[PDB]
């Protein structure tokens, strides 16, 4: 249902990320999400360390 591949890329970006944009925007949002997830994992590890 796509006229071209560019709008399909935008649709993929909108499906996997809230903010519409290009493939670079998709990569940036996913990188920020993975960084935040790593920060949360390290926070859990620090909670381990505080309990210990």
Q: Which residues bind a copy of itself (CB under 8 A)?
A: 1-2, 5-6, 8-9, 11-12, 14-16, 23-24, 26-27, 30, 33-34, 36-37, 40-41, 43-44, 47-48, 50-51
Of the candidates 2, 46, 21, the residue with the CA atom closest to the CA atom of residue 30: 21
| Smallest separation, CB 23 to a copy of itself (Å) | 5
DSSP SS3 for 17:
coil
| Smallest separation, CB 20 to a copy of itself (Å) | 12
* Residue 36 to residue 30: CA distance in whole angstroms: 10
């Amino acid at each position: 249902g796509f006229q071209n591949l560019s709008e399909f890329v935008t649709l993929i970006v909108q499906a996997v990320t809230g903010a519409p944009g290009g493939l670079t925007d998709l990569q940036a949002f996913l990188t920020e999400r993975w960084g935040d997830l790593a920060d949360a994992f390290q926070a859990v590890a620090n909670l381990i360390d505080a309990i210990a």
